[PDB]
Amino acid sequence: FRLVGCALLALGVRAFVCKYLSIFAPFLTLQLAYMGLYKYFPKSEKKIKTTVLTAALLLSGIPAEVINRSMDTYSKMGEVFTDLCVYFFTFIFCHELLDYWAADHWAWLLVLSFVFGCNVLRILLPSFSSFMSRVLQKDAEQESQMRAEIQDMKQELSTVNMMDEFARYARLERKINKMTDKLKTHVKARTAQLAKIKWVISVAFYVLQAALMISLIWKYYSVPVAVVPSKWITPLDRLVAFPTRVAGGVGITCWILVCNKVVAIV
Amino acid sequence: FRLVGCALLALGVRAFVCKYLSIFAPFLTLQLAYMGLYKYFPKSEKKIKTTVLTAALLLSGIPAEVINRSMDTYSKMGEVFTDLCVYFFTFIFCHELLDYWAADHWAWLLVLSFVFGCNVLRILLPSFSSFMSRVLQKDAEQESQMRAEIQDMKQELSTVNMMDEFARYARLERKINKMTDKLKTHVKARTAQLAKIKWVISVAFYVLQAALMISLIWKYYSVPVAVVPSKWITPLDRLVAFPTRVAGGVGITCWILVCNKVVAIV
Amino acid sequence: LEPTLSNIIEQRSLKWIFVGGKGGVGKTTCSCSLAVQLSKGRESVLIISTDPAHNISDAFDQKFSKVPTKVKGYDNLFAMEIDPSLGVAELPDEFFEEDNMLSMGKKMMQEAMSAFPGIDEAMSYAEVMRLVKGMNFSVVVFDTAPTGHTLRLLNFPTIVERGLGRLMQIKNQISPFISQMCNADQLASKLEETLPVIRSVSEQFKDPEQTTFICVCIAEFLSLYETERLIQELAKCKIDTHNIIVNQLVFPDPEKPCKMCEARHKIQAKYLDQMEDLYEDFHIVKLPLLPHEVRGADKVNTFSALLLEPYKP
Amino acid sequence: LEPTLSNIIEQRSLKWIFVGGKGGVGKTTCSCSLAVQLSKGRESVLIISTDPAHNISDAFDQKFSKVPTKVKGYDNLFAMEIDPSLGVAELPDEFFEEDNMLSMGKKMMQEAMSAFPGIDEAMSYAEVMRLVKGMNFSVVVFDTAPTGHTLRLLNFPTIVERGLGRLMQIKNQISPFISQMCNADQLASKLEETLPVIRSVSEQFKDPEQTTFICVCIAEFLSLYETERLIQELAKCKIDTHNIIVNQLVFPDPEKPCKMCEARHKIQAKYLDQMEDLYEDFHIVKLPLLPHEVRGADKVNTFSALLLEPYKP
Ligand SMILES: [Zn+2]
């Protein structure tokens, strides 16, 4: 349901796109969030599920209400951060539109292409999972034969009696149980191997994308990227003007965060 | 994953927004869909789940492959219809933007307000479910007392032995089973009542929104709504110009379909 | 109440008599003697054996098959052993495990176009029922297997019923669609001729006046508890049950010949006191223990005689 | 192999002897006689009774409690009845039903801040184990209840173990966070003093050289099948089992006094042939049936004597 509010806020931002009648642009977002909270006041549907990390902190004596408010305000600041990010994205959109009717434009296009490429490669990593799908196919024949053996043993046990020949019935039941336990162990081993492979490939992807990001920063740390008049976004201008008095290293994380958010919650 | 393609197509459309260099605007969408299909060719992830309506049609002798192609092309035309809808929405956006730098504008705003109001009322119908939440609270006391009775019987049965007093143990087990069966019957009755109430309120909502829609048509059937130059969207202009040579009754269903799609798949 | 099985014999409206009970109890001999006793009053009795060990073959020292065959020494009795019954009753183990009301039909259709193993079960069961009803037997005595319960199977195809009702509802819509876009008949056919017999037998099963269940146990906590669970499960399915028969009773003579006879008698006395306290609304048929040398038709006749009238030394 | 229970007595490395078995078998008398026999070789024996009917009280015609109390007529034996054991073993029925490896800890914590009923079970069990280990008994003989199995409970807190390991891992991170944003100790404390005894007893349970299980059954298909299932479930949990004791055996004399004695002897002979064929790697202890007038300490001594050396008339 949170994405419903995100979409409503995004359509509101796109309605206020490139609108300079009101100087207080981030405040416009503040009342957007206020309206969202007012609408959520009778529509506060949420799902809380038990996790593992919270167990240790609960055992540390922290009050449960304190932990609940911590997590829900953490969520709240998460979506307000994403919403401010898309707000800045729409302001950039206004900027190149007024430019249409300029190294900033090429820088914007290049950083956009880089972030979309990283994100699509991350999302097609499951398509890159063929290198382990081949091992799955290799083990498939073993699994098939050793389940055919299960079926043969089960039908043979169904053939034999149970009253006057309990010895053979019990021995065959023992064999069936042992082979099914072996099947479960093999399945769990396959699952663990796949999970470990996914984890290691994911951390490799994270390190390579971090290297690409830092290379992009070293390339464009001394180059202006997103130039806006100061008094337009002056409440937070000093924060966004991290490198060389321009919207740089905050813009990059805005782009990557909003793209990851949309392609994840999508 | 389908919403990923929808978002990619939407961002492509918004990249081609208000771009009149190429006359073949719907074709631009045609190659958009072609690129989507080409990208999905190695990325055709889908989930097919067994339903009830397909059972009767499978029992009617229709080949399974025929049914699969029927359903997947039905899906495909569904998303291409939604994508053409958002394409027309972006063209309208271009139209009022060029108007910014006009009864069509008030008509657009009014139909938008009507469709958003209908959709938000439909989505807050669960908040309107208080009229049956009160009945749930009314039955809650009965449920609580008759589960407390279950707990009392269970603990008393745990107290009694089983070997030397099997008669009392079996009688108490019978009573516990009967009371738990009564609990299950009451729960199923509550679920059926709630489902029937939701169904009847939903059909009432559908009929009232249909009445509102047809009233809107009777109000604006003879009034132009969305005026565009013919040669811009001329491949499908004759279809969209349903009333009085203007984008009317197709525009309304575009708006309602895209809004329902976003607020449902959201 | 009554320590005999005369209520079954005097109820001439019975048409499906089941004899259940798990464990080491010799319930096949009890059911065969019940069928022998029934043969004295009815015009034709059938004995269906769903057990895999073919016990009624040894009881009558004859060889039976999947068709009803006359047993020697009797003019009304017929016997039949159907291993296909257990073979097709093992298959719905998944349905028994889930026992749902919406998804079991989904599973059945999924296996239908995946492996087709369930509608084949329905055909086999319908064929057995059609043979039973076409030979026109007055009563049929089932020897249910000690493991499993195929009686509930008849309550499953109700999902098939309302699915076919939805099929009839969409019948007027598929034909115009078929004409718009343009074997089919054999499936709906075989469903149409295999449904009515299933419905007749299922309606007869739920009728207490033409279907009864006799639970066979012995004087012991384990068998008593198993039969209590069986009775509770049977009543949960709305299936009549009125008689239980206890086997391997000792009944020592007043001569006090053996200490161990009185020890076992005390144990069994405790268990029967528990049973009678629990089952005041049942018919407790106490069947003693017969000699090892008395095996075959003689023991069947003896058990039938003791079923007709109570045994007390 | 061997028809006696001497392997248990001669194994002086045993410290946890469990006596299991469902049904109507008089396993309490067998376990009490085993404890009496053990008292002749060890320095101190304890008899824990987890059954609700308090059978060892009737066996020794004494009244016991939740603390170890000297039994009359013996100098080494001690007895204790702990109904709290079954009271806290009924509670983890949900964990027994699921028997998962990831979500059971989630359920335990959910009930912990919702009702706190499970850590209380852990404390009760740890207290019982601490009392047992602090009184320093050579051997402890458990009379496991005929229904349920609390032995697997010790394998559950491994989720608690690695959760506490993650707690130690995040210990260096919570404190700086606590300083940044700014009872706690009692929970981690009671966990820290209730874990080691649980781990000691669980490690002793899985060691075949200091933990054994004796399964008690009778010559019958139902009890034989129940004990076969019990043995399979016990082996699935990697728990040692080497002896089974069959009760209520007749052993008729060659005088042929009663026909029913030989009939029951034939039935039991079939069942024991099946058992010995199935259990060539077990110790089959055949215990006969004692008089009804022989009840109490005399029957306990008789069963102990027949456990030490095989009985054959
Ligand atoms: Zn005798």
Author numbering:
A (entry chain D), B (entry chain C): 191 to 291, 1005 to 1169
C (entry chain A), D (entry chain B): 24 to 205, 214 to 344
What does the paper say about this structure?
The eukaryotic guided entry of tail-anchored proteins (GET) pathway mediates the biogenesis of tail-anchored (TA) membrane proteins at the endoplasmic reticulum. In the cytosol, the Get3 chaperone captures the TA protein substrate and delivers it to the Get1/Get2 membrane protein complex (GET insertase), which then inserts the substrate via a membrane-embedded hydrophilic groove. Within the membrane targeting stages of the GET pathway, the homodimeric ATPase Get3 (also called TRC40 in metazoans) adopts closed and open conformations in response to nucleotide load and interactions with other pathway components, allowing binding and release of the TA protein respectively. However, the cryo-EM structures and native mass spectrometry of hsGet1/Get2 and scGet1/Get2 show they form a 2:2 heterotetramer, which is stabilised by Get3 and interfacial lipid binding and is important for efficient TA protein insertion.
